[PDB]
């Protein structure tokens, strides 16, 4: 429960200046969040895809 | 009066004969059990072993029927 609250502090305060590059969304699942909560966090962001058909 | 000793040669091969080997048959059996139990124990972690063998054993078999809740599974 403290881990979950600490995630929220990271997300709302520290993440403005600090990365957490070694953690994937799947890492939170079954630790701090459910599969669905973590998918929701991931789906709100945009990541680089593979180039389209015109490259 | 006895003219000759009374005996036969039993069939043998590489110094084994049937009377001797027959005494060891049960021992091979137990060693086979030991090897079976040992082998099965070694692969008890393998999911297929659980699915196909261990979970089917009556009463005991529920030890190996364990589901991760969908909420806790990233994959
Ligand atoms: C798991 C670990 C496996 C260890 C398995 C050991 C099996 C050894 C069996 C064995 O020595 O049998 C001897 C028997 C013949 O007897 P003898 O002629 O040696 O008295 O030989 C025959 O009968 C043939």
DSSP-assigned states of every residue in chain A? -HHHHHHHHHHHTGGGT---TT--HHHHBTTTB-HHHHHHHHHTS-------TT-
Question: Number of Cβ pairs closer than 8 Å across A and B?
Answer: 20
Q: Are A1 and B39 in contact (CB under 8 A)?
A: no
What is residue B65's three-state secondary structure?
Answer: coil
Phi, psi dihedral angles at A42 (to 5 degrees)? -70, -45
State how far the Cα of B41 lies from the Cα of B63, in Å rounded to an integer: 14
User: How many domains in chain B?
Assistant: 1
Helix (H) or strand (E) holding B16: strand B16-17
Question: Which are the contacts of A42, defined by CB distance < 8 A and separation ≥ 6?
Answer: A25
Phi-psi region of B46 (alpha: psi -120 to 50; beta: other; left: phi over 0): beta
Half-sphere exposure of A31 (CA within 13 A, CB side): 12
B30 Cβ under 8 Å from any chain A Cβ = no
Which domain, by its residues, includes B18?
1-75
Q: Is B40 in the pocket of ligand 1 (CB under 6 A)?
A: no
Entry resolution (Å): 2.1
Residue to mutate (ligand 1; options B14, B18, B20, B42; most atoms within 8 A of CB): B20
For residue B25, which atom of ligand 1 is closest to its CA? 23
Among the listed residues B74, B7, B28, B6, the one whose alpha carbon sits nearest the alpha carbon of residue A37: B74
């Amino acid at each position: 429960a403290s881990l979950r609250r600490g995630y929220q502090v990271y997300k709302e305060v520290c993440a403005a200046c600090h990365s957490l590059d070694r953690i994937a969304w799947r890492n939170l699942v079954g630790v701090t969040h459910t599969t669905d909560e973590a998918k929701a966090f991931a789906e709100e962001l945009e990541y680089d895809d593979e180039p389209d058909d015109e490259g | 009066y006895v003219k000759k000793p009374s005996y036969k040669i039993v069939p043998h091969f590489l110094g084994f004969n049937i009377p001797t080997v027959s005494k060891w048959i049960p021992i091979f059996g137990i060693w086979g059990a030991a090897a079976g139990i040992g082998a099965l124990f070694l692969i008890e972690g393998v999911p297929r072993t659980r699915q196909d063998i261990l979970s089917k054993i009556p009463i005991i078999g529920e030890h190996w029927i364990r589901e991760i809740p969908a909420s806790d599974n990233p994959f």
